[PDB]
Amino acid sequence: ATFEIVNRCSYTVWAAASKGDAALDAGGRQLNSGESWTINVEPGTNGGKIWARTDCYFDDSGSGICKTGDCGGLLRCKRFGRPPTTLAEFSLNQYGKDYIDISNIKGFNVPMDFSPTTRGCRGVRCAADIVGQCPAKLKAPGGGCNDACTVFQTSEYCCTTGKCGPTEYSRFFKRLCPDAFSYVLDKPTTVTCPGSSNYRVTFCPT
């Protein structure tokens, strides 16, 4: 499946793509403002994620640091990124269908649209100014808006036993972005697409 990753932000981002125990395609790349990078994701990839990283520095070996979404200091991510990270999430070719969503469960750094480029389903978007509106206790000094689990490490925010409810913090994310997961047991906003759809992830779509 192809994913065209487009940076419409006025700032550089370092795109990342991983399924948590491996890179997807090269795993990451710099995208200056306006640039597009197309990756190929294998059929059957379960639990894939794409995200933006901000404020990165990499040496000539692809080792370094990012202020949001750092994946073990690698340009080419094999692992998931350090919160806060807005997440484009997907599982493809699942009993013949693909499933896509956006999640704020690991916080928010960059606005994004995640849409099919092929027929048969809608896209999802989280493009409100979550960083600007972020509650004081969730603001990340390194940049972005943390989720409450990251900040407070409670069973209720982290949904550790699978019984949690919505919270004042999750409701903030849900108010700003109704179309994204705000906590682990949120009413799902997952879209079912035809198996083997192709996609575009756009940072700063508005």
From Swiss-Prot:
Q: Does the keyword Signal apply?
A: yes
Q: Which family does it belong to?
A: Belongs to the thaumatin family.
Please name every pair of cysteines joined by a disulfide bond in this record.
C9-C204, C56-C66, C71-C77, C121-C193, C126-C177, C134-C145, C149-C158, C159-C164
**Primary location class:** cytoplasm
Which domain of life does this protein belong to? Eukaryota
Instruction: Name the chain's protein.
Output: Thaumatin I
Q: Which GO terms describe its cellular component?
A: cytoplasmic vesicle
Q: Which SMART domains match?
A: THN
- Specify the species: Thaumatococcus daniellii (Katemfe)
Protein location: Cytoplasmic vesicle
Known InterPro entries for this protein? Osmotin/thaumatin-like_sf (IPR037176), Thaumatin (IPR001938), Thaumatin_CS (IPR017949)
Q: Which UniProt keywords apply?
A: Cytoplasmic vesicle, Disulfide bond, Signal, Taste-modifying protein
Give a Pfam family name: Thaumatin
- Describe its function: Taste-modifying protein; intensely sweet-tasting. It is 100000 times sweeter than sucrose on a molar basis.
- S-adenosyl-L-methionine as a keyword of this entry, yes or no, is no
